[PDB]
Write a protein that binds this ligand. Structure first.
Ligand SMILES: Nc1ncnc2c1ncn2[C@@H]1O[C@H](COP(=O)(O)OP(=O)(O)O)[C@@H](O)[C@H]1O
Length: 204
């Protein structure tokens, strides 16, 4: 159930998965392929928990995790994507975004920070940004975490999912009620995408 718990075997599985993640990093580094991981969800959904578990055994030299907050005034002097462009990883490196550019079609939309034209146009803008990256030597995965203006958020999220879920930049939905499930799920999904990419290129 969502009201389920798993244990002890969890701990063993986590370690294995975490080590598999280390191996992934080694691959990414060697083949100079960047990884951008996006975590979006409502507060208390377990984003940060998942992030911690994902990179526990990864070398800190290899990754940077970015907490994303509302744009400050100096950020508003440029286009909305610029902040993210500055925080992009170099090839071989991992960038994790706690919240992200998807803010445009989520919070900004709900709280009226973005005009309707602005947020309506954004899905395609975002898709085009991600494609510029994915066409080259970046991998992107996006994670949404749900725990049982909340209705308005679900509506916004769905449209996000419809318009911006793409093969090269998938949206993965994770049930967060059991934190352990979620942490395992995030690791499993991250690893699989990387393996499929390794297959797409002739690697490992
Ligand atoms: N572009 C953005 N505009 C405003 N807030 C943003 C933006 N990107 C991220 N945020 C974060 O979202 C917070 C607003 O609450 P939010 O998480 O969107 O809703 P909820 O609490 O209902 O899940 C801000 O305090 C900030 O941490």
């Amino acid at each position: 159930l969502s009201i389920e718990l798993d244990k002890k075997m969890y701990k063993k599985k986590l370690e294995v998965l975490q080590y598999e993640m280390l191996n992934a990093q080694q691959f990414l580094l060697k083949n100079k392929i960047g990884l951008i991981l996006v975590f979006e969800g409502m507060d208390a959904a377990g984003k940060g928990g998942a992030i911690k578990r994902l990179i526990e055994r990864v070398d800190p030299r290899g990754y940077v995790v970015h907490p994303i907050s509302a744009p400050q005034p100096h950020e508003l002097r440029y286009n909305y994507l610029q902040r993210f462009w500055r925080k992009l990883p170099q090839h071989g490196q991992i960038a994790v975004f706690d919240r992200s550019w998807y803010g445009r079609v989520l919070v900004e939309r709900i709280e009226g920070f973005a005009t309707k034209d602005e947020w309506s146009r954004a899905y395609e803008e975002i898709n085009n940004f991600e494609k510029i990256l994915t066409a080259g030597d970046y991998i992107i995965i996006k994670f949404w975490l749900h725990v049982s203006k909340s209705p308005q958020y679900i509506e916004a999220a769905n449209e996000m999912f419809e318009k911006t879920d793409k093969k090269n930049a998938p949206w993965v939905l994770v049930a967060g009620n059991d934190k352990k499930y979620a942490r395992i799920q995030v690791l499993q999904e991250t690893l699989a995408h990387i393996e499929r990419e390794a297959l797409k290129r002739g690697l490992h």
